[PDB]
A paper describes a structure:
The PD-1/PD-L1 axis is responsible for inhibiting excessive stimulation and normally aims at maintaining immune tolerance to self-antigens by negatively regulating the immune response. By blocking the PD-1/PD-L1 interaction, activation of T cells can be achieved for an improved antitumor response. Therefore, the immune checkpoint blockade (ICB) of PD-1 or PD-L1 at the tumor cell–T cell interface has become an attractive strategy for cancer immunotherapy. Although the PD-1/PD-L1 interface is considered difficult to treat with SMIs due to its large, flat surface of interaction with no visible binding pockets, the number of patents and publications on anti-PD-L1 SMIs is constantly growing.
We were able to crystalize and solve the structure of the 8g compound in complex with PD-L1 at the resolution of 2.3 Å that allowed us to decipher the molecular basis of the interactions between them. The asymmetric unit of the hPD-L1/8g complex contains six protein molecules organized into three dimers, with one inhibitor located at the center of the interface of each dimer. 8g is mostly buried in the deep and elongated tunnel, which is composed of two PD-L1 monomers. The chlorine substituent attached to this moiety forms an additional halogen bond with the backbone carbonyl of AAsp122, providing the rationale for the enhanced inhibitory effect of these halogenated inhibitors at the R1 position. The methoxy substituent at the meta position of the distal ring of the terphenyl is also additionally stabilized by hydrophobic interaction with BIle54 and BVal68, pointing out the importance of this substituent.
Numbering used by the authors:
A (entry chain D): 19 to 44, 46 to 133
B (entry chain C): 18 to 133
Write the structure that this text describes.
C-alpha cells in the first residue's frame, strides 16, 4: 500500500478555498476499513474513521472550516478542503491513510496575499 | 476509540547506551499480527516498518541497519518498543510511532542524548 501526492506543493490565494489531494488505491470502497487523517503543525484537521468525520477530536481552528470530500474517496482520492485560507494555513500538511495497509505523505501549502 | 499512548514522551539517555522507547496500544485477546502495522520514524527516516508480522529491512534507513529492533515479545502486551543499541548524538530528536491495529493513531517521543 502506498499513498501518493501528484502535487506536493500548493500555491493558493488568500481567502481562497483549497482542496489538497492524497491518492490511495481503489473493488468497491470498504468504508468500515478506511481511516483518513489530515494534520498540520500537529493539529487535528480531519479524522475520518469508518464512514465519517469525528469532530470531537478536530482542532478548534478547523471546526467547520475543513472537510474531507466524501464523494471523492470512491475515486481513491483523499481530498481535504479548507475554506477561506489564511496566511497561517501555509505549511506542511500530512495525509495518513489506513485502508488495508497504511501510509502517509506530505503536502506543502503556500498562501499568497492579493 | 483506538488510541496509542506514551507513558514517557521524553527520554534522556547516555551517549553509547541502549534505549528502548515505548508506545502502548490496546489489545483484548490474542494479538492478530495480520491486522497490525507498526512504523517508527525520526526526522523522516524510516526505522521500523513492521507490517503484517514481518519487519521490512529493504525500507529501513541505512543508519539503523543492525542497530534497531522492534521487540516482538512486547507486541503481544500491547507495547511497541523500539530498541536502539549504542546511541550517538545523531539519535536525539523527535520519534513517531504510528500503529494501525483496527484503528490508527500515532504519538511523538523526544529523545535527548547527553554528550560523550
Ligand atoms: C484515528 O485517528 C488517527 C489516525 C491516524 C492514522 C490514519 C491513517 C494512517 C495511519 C498510519 C499508521 C501507521 C503507519 C502509517 C500511517 O504510515 C506508515 C506506516 O505506518 C495513522 Cl497513524 C493517525 C492519527 C489519528 C488521530 N487519533 C487521535 C487519537 N485519539 S482518539 C480519541 O481520536 O481516538
Amino acid at each position: 500500500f502506498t499513498v501518493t501526492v501528484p502535487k506536493d506543493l500548493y500555491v493558493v490565494e488568500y481567502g481562497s478555498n483549497m482542496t489538497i489531494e492524497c491518492k490511495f488505491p481503489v473493488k468497491q470502497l470498504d468504508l468500515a476499513a478506511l481511516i483518513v487523517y489530515w494534520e498540520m503543525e500537529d493539529k487535528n484537521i480531519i479524522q475520518f474513521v469508518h464512514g465519517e468525520e469525528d469532530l470531537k477530536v478536530q482542532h478548534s481552528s478547523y471546526r467547520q472550516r475543513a472537510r474531507l470530500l466524501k464523494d471523492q474517496l470512491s475515486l481513491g482520492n483523499a481530498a481535504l478542503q479548507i475554506t477561506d485560507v489564511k496566511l497561517q494555513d501555509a505549511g506542511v500538511y500530512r495525509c495518513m491513510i489506513s485502508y488495508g495497509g497504511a501510509d502517509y505523505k506530505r503536502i506543502t501549502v503556500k498562501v499568497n496575499a492579493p
